[PDB]
Structure 1
């Protein structure tokens, strides 16, 4: 909710910084396996735990 604990707000803060796509230059590398970010999570799709 609006009423958060400091520990939970740092938990959410990590999950937002992990919910960005791959940089466009990453798959121009030599050992190129990654196409897109498979671990991208959406607020309707998956509910983050908690």
Structure 2
């Protein structure tokens, strides 16, 4: 219906999975050092390279 190419689809799927917050057990294991990482992307703010 909207007609994507398969490889573009797979790249968009990876970009989708990448986008979540740090797990809680990681903060605990690290003693509150790793609490945010450089790739939180929102679909209205920062656009990807298609």
Interval containing the TM-score (normalised by the shorter chain):
0.7 to 0.9
Q: Deviations over 1:3-34 (max 9, x none)?
A: 10000000000001000111111011147531
The TM-score normalised by the length of structure 2 is 0.79
Aligned length: 49
Flag the structure with more relative contact order, 1 or 2, with Cα contacts below 8 A and sequence separation at least 6: 2
Unaligned runs of 5+ in 2: none
Query: Any idea what SS the aligned residue of 1:29 has?
Result: helix
4+ residue segments displaced more than 4 Å:
none
TM-score, reference length from structure 1: 0.79
* Structure 1 unaligned spans of 5+: none
RMSD value, Cα = 1.7
